[PDB]
């Protein structure tokens, strides 16, 4: 009986109801829902008997970053009385603990400080500097406020959130676009490579060079329908999940428009799609299992030399894998059982080179299931990093039960922070018909091991529908009246019992240690953008300062691209961070949420160059201006400093990734100068060459005309942070190589990944590729008026 109501609840969370997958009667999808609901339900289990510490690092993963004195604000959970202590940014959280216990009325390892109105928590033995709310309180000004939370209220916390050897030659039988004659060209792949020849059909419109022993065990037949006029295509493994060889007829639903990337699945729409019949030949046939493979194991000349040295390669150079995983020759049984052997005794590699062999160009089940292996040593903060890749990933995926969905599945259980981004990362593709079957199952699973965080996302998605229905009275409105009778119409609107419900007491989709509490209609309204984005203000009494806090609704736009971009600026920040370099970035968050739809992080006390330009005797000083007005006396030289250091940062980060279409009006600066980007609409060149504005260089300049110490100093960071990249290029290729899974516009192929490579100058030596840097900069320098 109450199966029903969670259920219900599941259907309308994951966009899909839950009688759509047992309409389908498909065991494949049978058997991955009562497979990975044991292995969910196993999970939860196991998390309500964890002690408080160890839930803490589950629902409140700690946020650090990658001696001196502080006076931090100290608060018990339940009382009104708050005291002020001189700690140490050396401290430990255990000895500032001991202070608010020492302190008044008649042991500091039974607590946890919280960070005052957000679910975010300061424990362990790390300095207090190591915390990134101290560490950000320390650079704003800000005074830290923390709350004396106990073990039992902890604990309360989990209480509350309770739950074969064939030499046989392998070898068609409606609603197609009519003009001109329909042929059918089929080829057989593994992966990128093709096994055999492309045979193709006969040449009016309703309408193999490999032997059977030969075939992989991840083969695709691929199809395509041509008239050159391109219909439609379809894709289809030849072995099925359970291991055996497909045998009889089968009517492929093609997609519209050989394709070996796409999708293996037939398209839904069942009623207005093209179908495809063919005859696959009777042989039970299933393929050789590990014991019986294990007890069988550049140029033409280099790969032959590679094949060779294969036993040396294991041995000399494990981490050589992958060149010898591309000179294997998959069109031959015998070839890839010698390579299998190889790779059961294969030492585990480091996670850089396991997440290149995640890539399309690795479609093997084994050599799959070693990269999954070596990614196990990954940490929260670096799986979480590369999250939205292994998402992208299972798209490549050839069946709905593999190793990838059972670690992603396995780790979003063991941390609630990594279990919130893998929904909206997988609720944000509902719409796609591709990936909505996998998506929707992946989801339903997550919530029978999350039954308590099921409610959490529930209240997350009950607000981006009013928001979708606030925005669309909003398009309607902004077209038909002036803007401040629609910012009333908007803020009548949300004053609605219904309405200030749903969008009040919730965790940010952004940021789930971000509580989105009161809402503030009176300074909520809307973005002048053809989309009419929302700006909607919160606060919490509680936070005080830090629960003043916006986000911004926007619906019409592709925001895929955008998130990407900053999660990039992102990891540039982290490496330059890791060789000492902070650049003083705003990577602000930005997450697609739905169709077209998502929501981007408001970066409070921060306007446009643009805002700032059209209002000083000349318009060069406007932006320092503006600076020496939120930035007085002595404050200036430091957000001098924060201006220079971002302003590096961005530029490097807009010229590698190559960022375009860069103007005043979505480039910003916050009071501190710290100065980023915002709108990040088209990349890799869609070759953009270093920029340097006259504007910021008067700025890092203070002022001056000719001020070659303050302006040489600036081309030292960008060059810093330049050879910083180069030293990671690797990482960024393998991340932006699995990202072309994702189906980008800017990103889908060679020449695209092309441009990452002469953009960080990978080829040249680090000596020649700083000079090719200091060529276009100065290039940027003379562009400079
Ligand atoms: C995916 O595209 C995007 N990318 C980045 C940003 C983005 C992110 C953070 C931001 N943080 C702070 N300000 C902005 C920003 C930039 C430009 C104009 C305005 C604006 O319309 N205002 C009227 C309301 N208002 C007040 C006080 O009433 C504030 C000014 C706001 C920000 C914009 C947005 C989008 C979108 N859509």
Not at 634 to 661: H, K, N, P
Request: with cysteine; net charge negative.
């Amino acid at each position: 009986r109450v199966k029903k109501l969670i259920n219900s609840q599941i259907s309308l969370l994951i966009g899909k109801g839950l009688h759509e997958f047992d309409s389908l009667r498909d065991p494949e999808v049978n058997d991955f829902r009562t497979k990975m609901r044991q292995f969910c339900e196993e999970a939860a289990a196991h998390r309500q008997q964890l002690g408080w510490v160890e839930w803490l690092q589950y629902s409140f993963p700690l946020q650090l970053e990658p001696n001196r004195a502080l006076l931090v604000n100290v608060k018990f959970e339940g009382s009104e009385e708050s005291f002020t202590f001189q700690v140490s940014t050396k401290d430990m959280p255990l000895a500032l603990m001991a202070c608010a216990l020492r302190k008044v009325f008649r042991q500091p390892e039974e607590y946890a400080l919280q960070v005052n109105g957000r679910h975010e928590y300061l424990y362990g033995n790390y300095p207090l500097c190591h915390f990134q709310y101290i560490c950000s309180c320390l650079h704003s000004g800000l005074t830290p406020h923390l709350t004396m939370v106990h073990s039992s209220s902890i604990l309360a916390m989990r209480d509350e959130q309770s739950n074969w050897s064939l030499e046989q030659p392998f070898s068609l039988i409606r609603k197609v676009n009519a003009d001109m004659k329909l042929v059918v060209q089929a080829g057989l792949f593994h992966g990128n490579e093709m096994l055999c020849k492309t045979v193709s059909s006969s040449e009016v419109c309703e309408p193999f060079d490999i032997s059977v022993c030969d075939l992989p065990r991840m083969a695709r037949l691929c199809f395509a329908l041509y008239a050159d006029c391109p219909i439609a295509w379809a894709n289809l493994m030849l072995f099925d999940y359970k291991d055996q060889l497909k045998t009889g007829e089968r009517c492929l639903y093609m997609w519209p428009s050989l394709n070996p990337a796409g999708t293996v699945r037939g398209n839904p729409n069942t009623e207005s799609a093209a179908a495809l019949v063919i005859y696959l030949p009777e042989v039970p046939v299933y393929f050789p299992a590990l014991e019986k493979i294990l007890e069988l194991g550049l140029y033409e000349h280099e790969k032959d030399l590679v094949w060779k040295m294969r036993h040396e390669v294991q041995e000399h150079f494990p981490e050589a894998l992958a060149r010898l995983l591309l000179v294997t020759k998959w069109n031959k049984h015998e070839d890839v059982a010698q390579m299998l052997y190889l790779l059961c005794s294969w030492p585990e590699l480091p996670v850089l080179s396991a997440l290149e062999l995640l890539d399309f160009s690795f479609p093997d089940c084994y050599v799959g299931s070693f990269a999954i292996k070596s990614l196990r040593k990954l940490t929260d903060d670096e799986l979480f990093q590369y999250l939205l890749q292994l998402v992208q990933v299972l798209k490549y995926e050839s069946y709905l039960d593999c190793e990838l969905t059972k670690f992603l599945l396995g780790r979003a259980l063991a941390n609630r922070k990594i279990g919130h981004f893998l929904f909206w990362h997988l609720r944000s593709e509902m719409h796609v018909p591709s990936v909505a079957l996998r998506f929707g199952l992946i989801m339903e699973a997550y919530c029978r091991g999350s039954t308590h965080h099921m409610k959490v996302l529930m209240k997350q998605g009950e607000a981006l529908s009013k928001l979708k229905a606030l925005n669309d009275f909003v398009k309607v409105s902004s077209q038909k009246t002036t803007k401040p009778q629609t910012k009333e119409m908007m803020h009548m609107c949300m004053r609605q019992e219904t309405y200030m419900e749903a969008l009040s007491h919730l965790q940010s989709p952004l940021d789930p240690s971000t509580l989105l509490e009161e809402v503030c209609v009176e300074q909520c309204t809307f973005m002048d953008s053809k989309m009419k984005p929302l700006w909607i203000m919160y606060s919490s009494e509680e936070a005080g300062s830090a629960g003043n806090v916006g986000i911004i609704f926007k619906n019409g736009d592709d925001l895929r691209q955008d998130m990407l971009t900053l999660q990039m600026i992102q990891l540039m920040d982290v490496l330059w961070k890791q060789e000492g370099l902070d650049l003083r970035m705003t990577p602000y968050g930005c997450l697609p949420t739905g169709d077209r739809t998502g929501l981007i992080e408001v970066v409070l006390h921060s306007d446009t160059i643009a805002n700032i330009q059209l209002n000083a005797a000349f318009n060069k000083d406007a932006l320092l201006n503006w600076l020496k007005s939120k930035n007085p006396g002595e404050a200036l030289d430091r957000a001098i400093e924060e201006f220079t250091l971002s302003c590096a940062g961005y530029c490097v980060a807009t010229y590698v990734l190559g960022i375009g279409d860069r103007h005043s009006d979505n480039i910003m600066i916050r009071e501190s100068g710290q100065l980023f980007h915002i709108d990040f609409g088209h990349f890799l060149g869609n070759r953009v060459p270093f920029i340097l504005t006259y504007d910021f260089v008067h700025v890092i300049q203070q002022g001056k005309t000719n001020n070659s110490e303050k302006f040489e100093r600036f081309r030292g960071y960008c060059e810093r942070a330049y050879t910083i990249l180069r030293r990671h290029g690797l990482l960024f290729l393998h991340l932006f190589a699995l990202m072309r899974a994702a189906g980008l516009p800017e990103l889908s192929c060679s020449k695209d990944i092309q441009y990452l490579k002469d953009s960080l100058a990978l080829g040249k030596t680090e000596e020649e590729a700083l000079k090719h840097f200091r060529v276009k900069f100065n290039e940027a320098l003379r562009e400079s008026w």
